[PDB]
Amino acid sequence: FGPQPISRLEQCGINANDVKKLEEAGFHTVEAVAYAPKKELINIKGISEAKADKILAEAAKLVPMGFTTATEFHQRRSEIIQITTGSKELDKLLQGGIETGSITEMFGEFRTGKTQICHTLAVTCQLPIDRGGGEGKAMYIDTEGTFRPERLLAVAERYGLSGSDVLDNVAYARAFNTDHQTQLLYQASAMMVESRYALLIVDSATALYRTDYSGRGELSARQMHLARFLRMLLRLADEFGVAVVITNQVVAQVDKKPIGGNIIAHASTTRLYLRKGRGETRICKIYDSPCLPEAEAMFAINADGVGDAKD
Amino acid sequence: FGPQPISRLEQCGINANDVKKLEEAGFHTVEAVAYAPKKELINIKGISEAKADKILAEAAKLVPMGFTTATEFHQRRSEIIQITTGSKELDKLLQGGIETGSITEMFGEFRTGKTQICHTLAVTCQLPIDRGGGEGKAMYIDTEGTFRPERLLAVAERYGLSGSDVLDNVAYARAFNTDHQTQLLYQASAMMVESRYALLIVDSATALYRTDYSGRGELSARQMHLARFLRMLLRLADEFGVAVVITNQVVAQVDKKPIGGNIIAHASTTRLYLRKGRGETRICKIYDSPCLPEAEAMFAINADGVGDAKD
Amino acid sequence: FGPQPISRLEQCGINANDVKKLEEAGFHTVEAVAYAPKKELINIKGISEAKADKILAEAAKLVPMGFTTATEFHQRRSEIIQITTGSKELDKLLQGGIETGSITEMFGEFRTGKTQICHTLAVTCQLPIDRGGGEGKAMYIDTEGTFRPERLLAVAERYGLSGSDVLDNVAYARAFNTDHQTQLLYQASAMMVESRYALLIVDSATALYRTDYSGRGELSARQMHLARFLRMLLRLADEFGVAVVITNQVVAQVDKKPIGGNIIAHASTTRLYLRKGRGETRICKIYDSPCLPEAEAMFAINADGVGDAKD
Ligand SMILES: Nc1ncnc2c1ncn2[C@@H]1O[C@H](COP(=O)(O)OP(=O)(O)NP(=O)(O)O)[C@@H](O)[C@H]1O
Ligand SMILES: Nc1ncnc2c1ncn2[C@@H]1O[C@H](COP(=O)(O)OP(=O)(O)NP(=O)(O)O)[C@@H](O)[C@H]1O
Ligand SMILES: Nc1ncnc2c1ncn2[C@@H]1O[C@H](COP(=O)(O)OP(=O)(O)NP(=O)(O)O)[C@@H](O)[C@H]1O
């Protein structure tokens, strides 16, 4: 029920031809269709004045904000679900868990468990609201080929759900390059129209972007392309309130650091760092998150997935 | 009491039809209606000569400057309120605080606390004049979705005010694109007609402008659009004397820098830089401000908001 | 004593009605009334032949040049006062200072100190001729709202003058748009009739002109309007010999530059560039000035105003 469909903005100014171009353009709702600047709609082989009428009409009949106090907004935030991670110590750290209708991503070294957390979340989101993760199908865009359904099965056994049913409600595709990476998101937006989603794990979203192209010159272009990809996610984030989790790679300071420069920085509504401890033990620390201060946690990696310190 | 309303410029040349177009055009006062060039009024389906009469009539009965010495002006500046930041060290830096009827904005890296300062100011402005921040409702245009009423509650507890009352006097809306960004300002101007305002925090005003469009070609257009947005703010700044605070993003030099190019530069009646120090500690330094020289400060981020170096 | 009044051109052809229109037209002298071509006077609801008689009469009794050698003119240039800047290094650069009965303007980046220099000059012009700046009241048209009387007080303390008296002899108004910008100049011309003036700082004269209107189309109009504004200044420059200083904004080359195209180019009787150096230090360099070739200078910004390199 979360969004209002495109076929709803059919007041008296949605003809066949009019709405024959908006869907194909990549608009499968009224929200993301309003959210768009005159700039957007005009660049899609429409008529200047015809397209302008389309905007104003929909906008009046979509609640396009206009200083709606703060008390009312405060209540809005109380209704937002927070997904459980499976570790009590990790849950405590997030004062509940991973926020929806936001951007939340972790980076660390290889072996640290960023890929791990994603698999665990893919299952934990397939539960009753009362048991943390609220009902809603999970989508996984992997870029590393590090998807392992077997890992999901072990998590399903811990939480005592039918593996086969859980795997029906997690959806997968592999993005293989930058242009594909962006392109895949348009398919994503269509997917969440038909059925209610809760979760995105985009495995290594930004990690592809380093091998992708350039290096040090015509990187301007990379930052532009990433920023464009990232704004789309955020569009997708407020439109439906699906929870965006991105995986990140790191680079040494050489004079230990989340890659992609700053563009990813300003995007992040919540940041996390992983590093390896002794044996199976691992450390998560918050980096940048508006809500709660910087804090550390012990947790471990069990055969059941991401759990508390077995010791 | 700060402005004179549109229905005041009703001497003998404000008919129904005459004043039926000025409001809808985006004029909710006599100040901003005078401040306008013949250019402005003429571009709004009015009559050349009819509109010209409207200008001259209002202008004579609005004190449209004309070399009113400097001693008189000096006294005017003594009457301007300076908002407190909550950190004594930070307050000292601004020889009182954030000037009203101006443009004051900070930029830094992610995690630095630009968003932080905004939330803190949103509360500090809801106080008696004697306790720094003068009485007058706060308006928050966010673009990042980094608004957290919870953060405001912690600040309210420190200063011992009713959270619920404070949240009634802070107003919120999210701008989602360039055209929306500008559009939202027209609603803003109407808002401050009905009730007395003190504060604007526009979170990431300029930060939206990078993902917004183009890059390196047809950027001319971006600068034009930003400059237009920025002049409107300034219009709003002298008209009512509401205090404008803008958040900014940064870009690496690649051969560390406030984005949007120079257009934002000339706008700024006061500039600030934030960077991260060791632990919870942070550094603010002044950049460009006509009044006081370049100086540095230690401050920290407490659970109460932006405070002094706990140490 | 600098000009001859309008009521002086009352030989035998200045009636009530005749001189009832020239003042209101914007003529408060014989100089600017003579400099005007037939075109001017005829466009102000006068009689063709009546207005023609008005021209010829005044012209005969105003010394309207007529190829007056070179040697005599050379002596005229020796009598022109040159205002001090307060920095010995900066003074040396101008072989004395800012020429009067001319157009002298600086541009640079934000933070560079163009606004700074203006404030400093506003005080330095309130002195005995022997101490640089010659006696005569200062007028400041600001467009940015970057006027700070406090800055003038610090300068007054250095030069040991009564702040209150100095502020009585600096006059201020804010121009808020193009039409206002031009309009304000007519009030200016009247101001200098009653009392002897020395100085104009027009803060950001041209800087308003970019946000003002258009962009890339119907810019021909901007050029026309600026050129008209600029010619008026020059009229004001030869008429009274009041010293015109204009502030300018800059634009990136995008393939660092004084804004407003070429029209400002030909106007400039002397040009200056500012850029930031290390710490409080700044560099001024001459651009285009007929008199002395291109040279560079170190100077600094002290709490006393614009001074020499403290080091
Ligand atoms: N079934 C399992 N039970 C317990 N531990 C496991 C299991 N499978 C793998 N591990 C270990 O748990 C750790 C998890 O980190 P891992 O998620 O593999 O890092 P990562 O995020 O994949 N790095 P990248 O390869 O760049 O994506 C590894 O060090 C593995 O050896
Ligand atoms: N309740 C709290 N008490 C103390 N510290 C906090 C609290 N909440 C968050 N923090 C931390 O304080 C810092 C504030 O910086 P922050 O305001 O989040 O940067 P920012 O301006 O939001 N960057 P952006 O995400 O681009 O808008 C962060 O590094 C947080 O970890
Ligand atoms: N009282 C003071 N003493 C010493 N330095 C100061 C003082 N006040 C301001 N400054 C600094 O001196 C510099 C002067 O430049 P400034 O005149 O502010 O540039 P500008 O011409 O105003 N640019 P714009 O904002 O476009 O008009 C700034 O970088 C200030 O931080």
**Three-class HEC string of chain C:** CCCCCHHHCCCCCCCHHHHCCHHHHHCCCCHHHHHCCHHHHHCCCCCHHHHHHHHHHHHHCCCCCCCCCCHHHHHHHHCCCEECCCCHHHHHHCCCCEECCCEEEEEECCCCCHHHHHHHHHHHCCCCHHHCCCCCEEEEEECCCCCCHHHHHHHHHHCCCCHHHHHHCEEEEECCCHHHHHHHHHHHHHHHHHCCEEEEEEECHHHHHHHHCCCCCCCHHHHHHHHHHHHHHHHHHHHHCCEEEEEECECCCCCCCECCCCHHHHHCCEEEEEEECCCCEEEEEECCCCCCCCCEEEEEEECCEEECCCC
Question: Which token pair is C104?
Answer: 């002298």
Counting atoms of ligand 3 from 1, which one is nearest the CA of C151? Answer: 1
How many Å apart are CA B140 and CA B123, to the nearest integer? 11
Q: C187 in the Ramachandran plot: left (φ > 0), alpha (ψ -120 to 50) or beta?
A: alpha
Cβ within 8 Å of residue A238, ≥6 positions away = A31, A35, A101, B145, B174, B176
How many Å apart are CA B153 and CA A257, to the nearest integer? 33
Cβ atoms of residues B115 and B144 within 8 Å: yes
Question: Which token pair is A119?
Answer: 């698999």
Pairing relation of β-strands B305-307 and C170-174?
Answer: unpaired
Counting atoms of ligand 1 from 1, which one is nearest the CA of A274? Answer: 21
Closest CA to B100 of B64, B133, B141, B147: B133
How many Å apart are CA A233 and CA B67, to the nearest integer? 54
Pairing relation of β-strands C98-99 and C82-83?
Answer: antiparallel
DSSP letter at B129 equals G
Phi, psi angle pair for C170, to nearest 5°:
-110, 130
Burial tier of C79 (Cβ tally within 10 Å: 0-12, 13-18, 19+): exposed
Cβ within 8 Å of residue A157, ≥6 positions away = A163, A304
How many Å apart are CA B186 and CA C133, to the nearest integer? 47
How many Å apart are CA A113 and CA A127, to the nearest integer? 23
Edge to edge, the sheet with strand B170-174 lists: B170-174, B137-142, B197-203, B243-248, B103-108, B270-276, B281-286, B296-302, B305-307
Cβ within 8 Å of residue A190, ≥6 positions away = A28
Chain B residues 70-89 within an 8 A CB cutoff of chain A: none
Phi, psi angle pair for C308, to nearest 5°:
-70, 160
Pairing relation of β-strands A170-174 and A137-142?
Answer: parallel
Question: Which token pair is A68?
Answer: 């709606």
Contacts of B288 in chain C (CB under 8 A): 110-111
- For B199, the enclosing helix (H) or strand (E) is strand B197-203
How many Å apart are CA C202 and CA C198, to the nearest integer? 13
Whether residue C218 lies within 8 A of chain B, CB to CB, comes out as: no
How many Å apart are CA B162 and CA A42, to the nearest integer? 47
- Give the position of tokens 């199976």: A280
Contacts of C109 in chain B (CB under 8 A): 262, 265
Q: What's the CA-to-centroid distance between A115 and ligand 1, angstroms?
A: 7
- Give the position of tokens 């040697």: C71
User: Which residues is A275 bridged to in the sheet?
Assistant: A283
How many Å apart are CA C139 and CA C248, to the nearest integer? 18
- The count of other CB atoms within 10 Å of the CB of residue A301 is 20
**How would DSSP label each residue in B147-165?**
--HHHHHHHHHHTT--HHH
DSSP letter at B272 equals E
Q: What's the CA-to-centroid distance between B116 and ligand 2, angstroms?
A: 6
How many Å apart are CA C15 and CA C6, to the nearest integer? 12
Question: Which token pair is A123?
Answer: 């299952």
How many Å apart are CA B122 and CA B137, to the nearest integer? 9
How many alpha carbons fall within 13 Å on the CB side of residue A160? 2
Residue nearest to atom 26 of ligand 2 (CA): A266
The reply to whether C114 sits in an annotated binding site is yes
Radius of gyration of chain A (CA): 20
**How would DSSP label each residue in B237-250?**
HHHH--EEEEEE-B
Closest CA to A245 of A307, A288, A190, A201: A201
Counting atoms of ligand 1 from 1, which one is nearest the CA of A150? Answer: 1
Question: Which token pair is B291?
Answer: 């009044």
- The count of other CB atoms within 10 Å of the CB of residue A287 is 17
The angstrom resolution of this structure is 4.2
- Give the position of tokens 């022997």: C130
Q: What's the first-to-final CA gap in chain A, in angstroms?
A: 44
Residue nearest to atom 16 of ligand 2 (CA): B113
Cβ atoms of residues A247 and A54 within 8 Å: no
How many Å apart are CA B35 and CA B64, to the nearest integer? 8
How many Å apart are CA A26 and CA C195, to the nearest integer? 69
Residues in chain A: 311
Cβ atoms of residues B259 and B248 within 8 Å: yes
Say whether B140 sits in a helix, a strand or coil: strand
Closest residue of chain A to B114, computed from CA coordinates: A290
Q: What's the first-to-final CA gap in chain B, in angstroms?
A: 44
Residue B291 is nearest to which of C144, C150, C207, comparing CB atoms?
A: C150
Q: Is C301 in the pocket of ligand 3 (CB under 6 A)?
A: yes
Cβ atoms of residues A3 and A62 within 8 Å: no
Closest CA to B221 of A42, A263, C107: A42
How many Å apart are CA B141 and CA C21, to the nearest integer? 52
Say whether B130 sits in a helix, a strand or coil: helix
Residues in chain B: 311
Cβ atoms of residues B241 and B101 within 8 Å: yes
How many Å apart are CA B168 and CA B173, to the nearest integer? 14
Whether residue C123 lies within 8 A of chain B, CB to CB, comes out as: no
Whether residue B265 lies within 8 A of chain C, CB to CB, comes out as: yes
How many Å apart are CA C144 and CA C134, to the nearest integer? 27
A145/chain B closest Cα distance in angstroms: 29
Distances (CA, A) of A121 to A85, A102, A132, A298, A304: 6, 16, 11, 18, 12
Ligand 2 pocket, residues with Cβ under 6 angstroms: A 266, 268, 286, 288-294; B 110-116, 144, 146, 301-303
Burial tier of A212 (Cβ tally within 10 Å: 0-12, 13-18, 19+): middle
Phi, psi angle pair for B119, to nearest 5°:
-55, -40
Counting atoms of ligand 3 from 1, which one is nearest the CA of B269? Answer: 25
Q: What's the first-to-final CA gap in chain C, in angstroms?
A: 44
Domain range summary for chain C, segments of one domain joined by +: 2-74, 75-311
Question: Which token pair is C306?
Answer: 């614009």
Cβ atoms of residues B85 and B305 within 8 Å: no
Contacts of B171 in chain A (CB under 8 A): 67-70
Cβ atoms of residues C139 and C200 within 8 Å: yes
DSSP letter at B8 equals G
Question: Which token pair is C199?
Answer: 């100085």
User: Which residues is B98 bridged to in the sheet?
Assistant: B83
Say whether A268 sits in a helix, a strand or coil: coil
Say whether B277 sits in a helix, a strand or coil: coil
Cβ within 8 Å of residue A42, ≥6 positions away = A48, A51
Chains C and A are touching, with contact defined as 3 or more CB–CB pairs separated by less than 8 Å:
no
Residues in chain C: 311
Closest CA to C132 of C106, C97, C108, C102: C97
Instruction: Give the ligand whose atoms come closest to the C-alpha of residue B201.
Output: 2
Question: Which token pair is A300?
Answer: 């471990």
Pairing relation of β-strands B197-203 and B243-248?
Answer: parallel
How many Å apart are CA B176 and CA B180, to the nearest integer? 6
Top-level CATH class of A75-311?
alpha beta
- Give the position of tokens 């009019």: A18
Residue B172 is nearest to which of A39, A70, A227, comparing CB atoms?
A: A70
Show the beta-strand stretches assigned E in chain A: 82-83, 98-99, 103-108, 137-142, 170-174, 197-203, 243-248, 270-276, 281-286, 296-302, 305-307
How many alpha carbons fall within 13 Å on the CB side of residue C84? 21
Phi, psi angle pair for A128, to nearest 5°:
-75, 140
How many Å apart are CA C123 and CA C119, to the nearest integer? 7
- SS3 readout for B17-69: HHHCCHHHHHCCCCHHHHCCCHHHHHCCCCCHHHHHHHHHHHHHCCCCCCCCC
How many Å apart are CA B142 and CA C199, to the nearest integer? 44
Instruction: Please report, as a single letter, which amino acid is at residue A13.
Output: G
Closest CA to B29 of B187, B139, B189: B189
Instruction: Please report, as a single letter, which amino acid is at residue C296.
Output: E
Question: Which token pair is C114?
Answer: 């163009």
How is chain B split among helix, strand and coil, in percent rounded to 5?
40, 20, 40
Closest CA to C267 of C245, C292, C251, C295: C245
Cβ atoms of residues A138 and A199 within 8 Å: yes
How many Å apart are CA B289 and CA B271, to the nearest integer? 6
Closest CA to B151 of B133, B173, B169, B166: B166
Q: B82 in the Ramachandran plot: left (φ > 0), alpha (ψ -120 to 50) or beta?
A: beta
Question: Which token pair is C297?
Answer: 């200078």
Phi, psi angle pair for A213, to nearest 5°:
-155, 180
User: Which residues is B270 bridged to in the sheet?
Assistant: B104
**How would DSSP label each residue in B74-105?**
HHHHHT--EE--S-HHHHHHTTTSEESSSEEE
CATH of domain B2-74: 1.10.150.20
Closest CA to B2 of B270, B237, B267, B245: B237
Say whether A227 sits in a helix, a strand or coil: helix
Closest CA to A130 of A201, A82, A78: A82
Whether residue B287 lies within 8 A of chain C, CB to CB, comes out as: yes
Number of H helices, E strands in chain B: 14, 11
b/e B253-277 (16+ beta carbons within 10 angstroms → b): eeeeebbbbbbbbbbbbbbbbbebe
Chains B and A are touching, with contact defined as 3 or more CB–CB pairs separated by less than 8 Å:
yes
Experimental method reported for this structure: cryo-EM
- State whether A35 and B177 contact (CB < 8 Å): yes
Question: Which token pair is A195?
Answer: 């059925």
How many Å apart are CA C125 and CA C292, to the nearest integer? 23
Q: B98 in the Ramachandran plot: left (φ > 0), alpha (ψ -120 to 50) or beta?
A: beta
Cβ atoms of residues C206 and C262 within 8 Å: no
How many Å apart are CA A137 and CA A135, to the nearest integer? 7
